[PDB]
Design a protein around this ligand. Structure first.
Ligand SMILES: Cc1c[nH]c2ncnc(NCC3(O)CCOCC3)c12
Ligand SMILES: [Cl-]
Length: 167
């Protein structure tokens, strides 16, 4: 039993809700919140910009030190950093950005990072400003993640389309 509330159950392990991931994280304080990161951990917009803003830019400060030490992530890769005031940890995961020409096949590799964590609050990877089809992202999520994932979908219209079209 966990404290996630109001989710629709899609499969044995995947749950979904129309919610602002920032507000969900502030309420639940999950062990892991997933960020829709880029390889530079530059949290400018989309989910990343919103999460970072909610930390009063502390996420960005921590991320800049991480990059200065370690260099950029790989597309499809991840790193674990602090969750600040939102969660215990933030798993920064880089899905392919279609608006940069990146290989959509890397979306499966990106979701594989979730399997290193028993329970996660997450957005759909590569959705929104990353330019992928969210219906496809949900399919890859369900077919790749085996741990317990609670998906927050900001757009109500999109949430309804994802549920209604789910096979
Ligand atoms: C931008 C943003 C702020 N707070 C959020 N919480 C959750 N998701 C988000 N964006 C990603 C999508 O949910 C958007 C529409 O289609 C699926 C991907 C955001
Ligand atoms: Cl977005």
């Amino acid at each position: 039993v966990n404290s996630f509330s109001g989710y629709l159950k899609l499969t044995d392990n995947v749950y979904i809700k129309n919610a602002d991931i920032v507000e969900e994280a502030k309420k639940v304080k999950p062990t892991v919140v997933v960020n829709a990161a880029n390889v530079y951990l530059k949290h400018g917009g989309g989910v990343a910009g919103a999460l970072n803003k909610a930390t009063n830019n502390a996420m960005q400060v921590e991320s800049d030190d991480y990059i200065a030490t370690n260099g950029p992530l790989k597309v499809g890769g991840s790193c674990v950093l602090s969750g600040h005031n939102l969660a215990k940890h933030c798993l920064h995961v880089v899905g392919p950005n279609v608006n940069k020409g990146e290989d959509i096949q890397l979306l499966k590799s990106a979701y594989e990072n979730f399997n290193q964590h028993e329970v996660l609050l997450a957005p759909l990877l590569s959705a929104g400003i990353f330019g992928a089809d969210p219906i496809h992202s949900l399919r890859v999520c369900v077919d790749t993640v085996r741990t317990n994932v609670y998906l927050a979908v900001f757009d109500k219209n999109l949430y309804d389309k994802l549920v209604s079209s789910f096979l």
